Amino acid sequence: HQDIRQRTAKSLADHYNIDREQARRVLETTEQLYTQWLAQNTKLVQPQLEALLKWAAMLHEVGLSINHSGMHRHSAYILQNTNLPGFNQEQQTLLATLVRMHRKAIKLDELPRLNLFKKKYYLPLIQLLRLSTLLNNQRQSTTTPESLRLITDDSHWTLRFPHGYLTQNSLVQLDFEREQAYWDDVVGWKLVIEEEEPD
Template sequence: MQRYHIDSKHAYRIEATALILLAQVKDAWQLNDPEFHDMLCWSARTHEIGLTISHNRYHRHSAYLLQHCDLAGFSHLEQQMLAFLAKGHRRKLPKDEYKTLPDEKRDAYLRLCLLLRLAVIFHRSRSKARLPAFSLQVDGNKLHLSFPSGWLDHHPLTCADLENESEFLKSMDYKLKVD
C-alpha cells in the first residue's frame, strides 16, 4: 500500500463495507473459512494499486502488479486469487481469469469479487459520510440488496451504478435486485 501510494483511509472504508457484506452472506454462500475474510481484506486494501501506473484501466494494472510482484508471505496461487479480485472489482467480470482459478475455489472467489464490487460502488464518491444501514440477502445466484426507504432516491449516481452492476452480473449468471 505504501509503495503504490494507496489512499489507505478509502481502502479501509471499502474493506469495512466488504466485511459487513461478507458477514451478511457468509453462511448462505459458505464463505466461513478465514481465508475468505483475509483475501477480501487484502483485495480491498490493494485493489487501487494500479492507479500509480494509470487511471485508465487501473484495475488491470492492479491485477498485474498483484500477480507478478514479490509479495512476501503469499503463494503464487494466493497472488493469482488477489489479482482476480482486483481485476474483477469494476467493469466487466474477468471470465478468462475466472476459468483459470482452481475448480474448488471458483464459486467462492467469484462471490468475494461480487462483495468487493458492491463495496466499491457504495464508496464511489470517496465520501467519508456514513453509509445507511443496508441489507444483502442471497439465495444461490440471486442477490437482494435493500436500503432505507428513499435513500436511493437521494443518491441517483449510486442507484445508476447498481443498475449497471446488475447488467454486469448477468454475464456470470447472477441476478441483483435493489430496493
C-alpha cells in the same frame, strides 16, 4: 503469515501511496456485507479466502498511478507480478484475480486455474468486492447508507437500501443500475435493488 502479509501490504501501500482512508472505507463495507453473506451461505465458508478478500479491499487501488482508466487491470498486474512475501503462488494469483474483476465487464473465461481454490468459494467474494468498491466510489464524499441488507440465494442477490436513500443519492442509484446490467451478462448472477419500507 498474518504479520508477514501485514508488512507486505504496508510496503505496497507506502510505495504506491495508496489512499488509506479509501482502502479502509472499502474494507469496512466489505466486512459488513461478508458477515451477512456468510450466515446465508455457510457451506461456502473459507477463512483463507476471507483473508485474501480483505487484502484485495486494501490493495485494489495499487494500480491507480498507472491509470484510473483500467485501474482494476493495472492493480491486478502489479499484484500478480510483484514479490509478495506471505502469499504463495495460488494465493497471489487469487488476490490479483479478485482485484482484476472488481469493476466493469466480467469474463468468467479469464478465470485462472487454481488447485487450491474452487470458483464456487471465490466467485461470491468477487461479487462482494464489486459491491463494496462501487458503494464507496465517491470517496470522501461518500454518503454511507445507515443500513444495507444483503439477501442471497446462491448468486442471485438482493441489496436493500434505507428508505429514501436511492432517491437522495442519484449517482449511487445510477451506478447500481449499471452493475445490475453487468450482472445480467454473467451466468448465475442476478442483482436486485430494493428499498426499506418507511415503517
